[PDB]
Paper text:
The final single-particle reconstruction based on 102,596 particles comprises a nucleoprotein filament of 9 RAD51 protomers and 26 nucleotides of ssDNA, bound to a dsDNA containing the central bubble region flanked by 15- and 16-bp-long segments of donor DNA. In the D-loop structure, RAD51 maintains the right-handed helical arrangement of protomers observed in pre- and post-synaptic filaments, with the same helical twist and a slightly compressed pitch relative to the pre-synaptic filament. The structure shows that filamentous RAD51 achieves strand separation by sequential L2-loop insertion of adjacent RAD51 protomers between the strands of the donor DNA. In total, donor DNA unwinding by RAD51-H and -G exposes a continuous csDNA stretch of five nucleotides for homologous pairing: A22-C25 of csDNA base pair with G9-T12 of isDNA, physically organised as a base-pair triplet of (A22-A24)cs with (T10-T12)is and one unstacked C25cs:G9is base pair, while G26cs remains unpaired. Successive L2-loop insertions extend the unwinding of donor DNA, with each insertion exposing a triplet of csDNA nucleotides for homology pairing with the invading strand. The structure of the D-loop shows that the esDNA is sequestered in a basic channel running parallel to the ssDNA-binding groove of the RAD51 nucleoprotein filament. The D-loop structure shows that the nucleoprotein filament interacts with the double-stranded arms of the donor DNA via the N-terminal domains of RAD51 protomers A and D. The RAD51-D NTD engages the minor groove of the 5’-arm DNA.
RAD51 polymerises on the single-stranded (ss) DNA overhangs that form upon long-range resection of DNA ends. The RAD51 nucleoprotein filament invades the donor DNA duplex and searches for sequence homology within a three-stranded synaptic filament intermediate. When homology is found, the invading strand of the filament becomes stably paired to the complementary sequence of the donor DNA, yielding a structure known as a displacement loop (D-loop), which ultimately progresses to strand exchange.
Residue numbers in the entry:
A (entry chain F), B (entry chain E): 21 to 339
C (entry chain D): 21 to 274, 283 to 339
Write the structure that this text describes.
DNA sequence: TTTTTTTCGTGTGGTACTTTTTTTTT
DNA sequence: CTGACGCTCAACATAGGTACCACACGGCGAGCTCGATGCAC
DNA sequence: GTGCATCGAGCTCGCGACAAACCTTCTATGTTGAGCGTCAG
């Protein structure tokens, strides 16, 4: 795991300065090393002279230079992929949800965005040989649609004890975009103490659709949303967790899409399209089945797979 | 219940600022705690320095951090589900209408959207052991179709006093979309003084269909509708009432039958589909019987049940 | 009845502002209070500052807050139900046509939609003890099928004076959908000066069926029809008149359903389905209602208007 | 006393119509 | 050593049929309309 | 005292793109062509 920020006192950093950093949301050496000099300057009691010393010492403990692609290829052979509960999705994702990267699932209502998040909150606790991340799950909810009954249904499927599954899911409810971002600061502190394997934000952009309304507030909305996605990327790099965010859709009311029966695109604009490394486009299928399409990915070919929402969470289409 | 906003002044907030907050529609500590910093700044005489202090004190009285899913599972085991008067619907909903969430019922004319709302306006006054919410009902009407004679019919079925039932229903008629939203501010003030168990908006989207006409006003329509649904969600979280809204349908005039799509869909677009946690799709049966289908839900399997609109409200089909 | 809009300027509104409202179709305080802020802003010369003040002043004169269902139940015990001239129809409607709501009658040709509208245009002038609304009737005709000779036949049945009955019916003929909506603005002005108990639009959707032809004009048709039904609803709330509209039918080729789509089905609080029976008898069926069970009654079109079947 | 610098950000679904065609003696 | 014939899959195309629809910021300044104040017999 | 004239106040409507960029083909049933196994000689 990441090195706790207490290691800086061994490099001559004053314990008072270390405590100032923790109040600023830095709990690991990696978090300090990745932070720009501007962020440390903004912290009261951290002058520019102190900031240079802190960054220099942190860079000693964290490798931040060039390296061969051969070494990097070796590490990526060891990153954990979390099973989605469906063989077809795992074939589509070539293993499952990938840790250390931001994955976005979007689609219209009832398409299963919350159902997949509930499945992942349990499958991430399985041992690695069974397709899990072997760690606790963190669930940040913005819609109020977190249902522990669904988690117990999934835990029944894999033979896990439901009581222990619930204890390993940290749940927080976000009521506004400011609270949604503030929860991440507590998330970083929690992830230092115990090993978390998955972070779920559902829905990531639900609150931005109403806190910032109108074209007048669009620039402030995207700027605030972009800062939120940077913190998610920081947590993914710092702790190696898998970040799964859920997105909504907006209809295109132009006549350009004649060949599409109901054209719609995810909200968030270009800020969230670039930030997400993997985007899954869920849509309604026949009955209880749904279709997942690789909308964006650095390494996955654009393809479709069909899954179903069963009583015991997300699974393959039985019929 | 929620803590009154007067608790803030015990933490050092000026009583004049509290009065300014109440004039802006915040009547409980939860309403202030859930408010983003933007909303408090908009209120005249609330500086940013005041806004930060007000939010800081509110967060001390309201838990807004992470918690175990075990504790959240414990809390949800105590929420109230209000019976719909029909055995089949209660089985379909696994108990009845759930408090603390937005439930949307839609369907074409005559399908029984208003009849269910009339039954719920009475059943919610039953004691909890009989399937009620043991609270008063609030009925916001946007069509003029509120008939107290129907309430008296349902009250006779359950043996309740007709005069007592009518006194425990608060009725307001909304004449436009602006008035419909403004009634929610009065709703929060009323819900602080007396225990309300159910809030009915019927119909939630009837007035939006004509106040904003054409694609030119579509964006302003959905933005206004989205703000209305946020206030409904805020009331559900703040007071724990069940919010039941009613929606209309619009025909699909493309090759929906060619692609096997349904010929009619609810209005409101993606703004109302995402916001509603549970959506019920009522359709006409034979005679007085109707069919209710779970259109969207976080925990309910997509199924159907048959109910009837009897002389004494919504009930089970007698044939 | 409704308070004249001239009461606003006694509350601090400039006289010129009230003039602009009247030219925009607002003639009572209720009409202004019920209007959204958008409608007032669209009036040239009225800014968002004026609109906020006007709406604030109107809300003082018009109650628009929450109230007990007991109080509302008390008011609905005093609404007037206009007799349809038929014992069976009145039993089916539990009193007759209800004021303050939009009632829609549809059916194929010859079913008696216009005959009922002719009977209602007379019975609405009866004293309340005899089942009337004790007010004048307004008849907006879009088909050209208004026949004053039918009114005289109905008036003779109840003993009313034939000349007096015809003087209490305001008749207008609509030649297109734009004109049909525009007549409602003139209707609001007339209803302030005199007590009307019934407004009839026959037929409401007849002109929409041809002014907007094809799927290419369907959205424009339904948007225009929706605004027409909102204006009718505004009149029903503002003046407490019974609004009776008449609708046509279309065959389902997937056996006949009313035209207008979902816009008119949701808007209409009560819908009556009329169909042909033996001889001159007809059958009326409650197709939609918030409080009336779906039942059927049989009436007849006699020489003296709609009445009970003689079978 | 001198001396300007710098773009950012997408959102929003609506809306039903139209009937047609007779056949076969014991 | 081989060909005629039926089964199933893999790929492919059309289905009662029909089609249109627009706005929305951040803001200063002409502009020009009328009330409130001042002026000519 | 009557008719006339002016300034403050109000509310209304512009102002700008470089004239392309868009790529989406749907669900579901039955059809069309081909790959393949059977059986007899
Ligand atoms: N126990 C269950 N068994 C089967 N299906 C279920 C069960 N619980 C929920 N579902 C289905 O899950 C579907 C998707 O619900 P979900 O909460 O995942 O939607 P969503 O994509 O988050 O939508 P929204 O935008 O409204 O939040 C629903 O249509 C419902 O039918
Ligand atoms: N007392 C009663 N007994 C039996 N059926 C009744 C009774 N009152 C009303 N109904 C029936 O209830 C049905 C549904 O009416 P309701 O007001 O619920 O419609 P709705 O879904 O709100 O429609 P709309 O879209 O017009 O608002 C009507 O068709 C009517 O036949
Ligand atoms: N004086 C009368 N005595 C008896 N029956 C009459 C009399 N006048 C008209 N009728 C009957 O009224 C019936 C229905 O006419 P009405 O004008 O009500 O039709 P409608 O429903 O408006 O039809 P449409 O769709 O053509 O407008 C006719 O079939 C006619 O026989
Ligand atoms: Ca969800
Ligand atoms: Ca991307
Ligand atoms: Ca209704
Ligand atoms: Ca939803
Ligand atoms: Ca007629
Ligand atoms: Ca209706």
């Amino acid at each position: 795991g990441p090195q706790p920020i207490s290691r800086l006192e061994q490099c001559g950093i004053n314990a008072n300065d270390v405590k100032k950093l923790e109040e600023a949301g830095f709990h690991t050496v990696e978090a300090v090393a990745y932070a720009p000099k501007k962020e440390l300057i903004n912290i009261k009691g951290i002058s520019e002279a102190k900031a240079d010393k802190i960054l220099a010492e942190a860079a000693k403990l964290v490798p931040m230079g060039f390296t061969t692609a051969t070494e990097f290829h070796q590490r990526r052979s060891e990153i954990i992929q979390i099973t989605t509960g469906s063989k077809e999705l795992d074939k589509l994702l070539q293993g499952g949800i990938e840790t250390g990267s931001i994955t976005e699932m979007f689609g219209e209502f009832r398409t299963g965005k919350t159902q997949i998040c509930h499945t992942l909150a349990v499958t991430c606790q399985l041992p690695i040989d069974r397709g899990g991340g072997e760690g606790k799950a963190m669930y940040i909810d913005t819609e109020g649609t977190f249902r522990p009954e669904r988690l117990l249904a999934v835990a029944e499927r894999y033979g896990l004890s439901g009581s222990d599954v619930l204890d390993n899911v940290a749940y927080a409810r976000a009521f506004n975009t400011d609270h949604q971002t503030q929860l991440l600061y507590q998330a970083s502190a929690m992830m230092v103490e115990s090993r978390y394997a998955l972070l779920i934000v559902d829905s990531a952009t639900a609150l931005y659709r109403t806190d910032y309304s109108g074209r007048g507030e669009l620039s402030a909305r995207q700027m605030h949303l972009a800062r939120f996605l940077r913190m998610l990327l920081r947590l993914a790099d710092e702790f190696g967790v898998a970040v799964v965010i859920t997105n909504q859709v907006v209809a295109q009311v132009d006549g350009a899409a004649m060949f599409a029966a109901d054209p719609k695109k995810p909200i968030g604009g270009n800020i969230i399209a670039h930030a997400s490394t993997t985007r899954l486009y869920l849509r309604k299928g026949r009955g209880e089945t749904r279709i997942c399409k690789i909308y964006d990915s650095p390494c996955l070919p654009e393809a479709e797979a069909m899954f179903a929402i069963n009583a015991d969470g997300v699974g393959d289409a039985k019929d």
